[PDB]
Amino acid sequence: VNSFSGYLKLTDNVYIKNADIVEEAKKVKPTVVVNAANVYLKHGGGVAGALNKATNNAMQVESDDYIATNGPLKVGGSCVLSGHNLAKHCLHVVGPNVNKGEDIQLLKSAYENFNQHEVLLAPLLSAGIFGADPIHSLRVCVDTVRTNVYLAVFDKNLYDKLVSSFL
Ligand SMILES: CC[C@@H](CNc1ncnc2nc[nH]c12)NC(=O)CC1CCCCC1
């Protein structure tokens, strides 16, 4: 038993809710919150800008030191950093950004990072400002992630469409 509330059950291991990931994080304080990152860990908008704003920019400061030491992430890759005031850890995961021309096949690789963590609070990768089909992202999630994932979808209208089309 965990502390996530009002999630609809999609599969054995995938749950979904119409919620702002920042508000879910602040209420739950999960072990892992997933950030929808880019390779430079420049957290400007969408999930990344919203989480970073909620950390008072501490996420960005930590991320800049990470990049200065390690260089950019790979598309499809990830790193574990602090969750600051939102979670124990933040798993920064880079899904492909279709609005930049990146291979959508890399979305499966991105979701594979979730399997290194038993339970995660996460957004829909590559969707929203990253430009990919959200129904496809949810499908890849369900077909790739084997650990327990609690998906927070910000847009109400999209959430209704995702559930109603899941089948
Ligand atoms: C589906 C991914 C999600 C990612 N963004 C966020 N996901 C969770 N919590 C967040 N808090 C702040 N941003 C958050 N984007 C949205 O839902 C917005 C809709 C995308 C399609 C077109 C209509 C808008």
Side-chain angles (χ1 to χ4, degrees), residues 31-48:
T31 304
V32 181
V33 66
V34 173
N35 182 32
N38 58 54
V39 296
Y40 305 111
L41 301 180
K42 287 174 56 93
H43 307 305
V47 173

Side-chain angles (χ1 to χ4, degrees), residues 42-113:
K42 287 174 56 93
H43 307 305
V47 173
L51 290 172
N52 176 61
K53 176 179 180 192
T55 75
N56 181 44
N57 211 51
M59 179 179 283
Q60 190 64 68
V61 169
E62 179 195 29
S63 292
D64 288 351
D65 171 82
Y66 173 92
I67 296 288
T69 298
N70 301 108
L73 296 182
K74 301 170 175 174
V75 180
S78 72
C79 67
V80 180
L81 290 174
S82 180
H84 299 279
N85 53 315
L86 301 178
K88 188 173 194 307
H89 302 108
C90 179
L91 181 69
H92 295 272
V93 180
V94 183
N97 189 320
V98 175
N99 303 319
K100 306 174 175 165
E102 301 171 347
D103 176 15
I104 194 56
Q105 300 304 127
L106 291 168
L107 185 55
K108 188 171 183 76
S109 302
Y111 276 117
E112 287 171 342
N113 294 286

Side-chain angles (χ1 to χ4, degrees), residues 19-22 36 46-48 50-51 122-125 127-129 134 152-156 158 162:
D20 185 341
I21 196 174
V22 178
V47 173
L51 290 172
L124 202 58
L125 298 178
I129 64 172
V153 176
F154 182 86
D155 190 82
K156 165 167 192 307
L158 179 61
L162 286 170

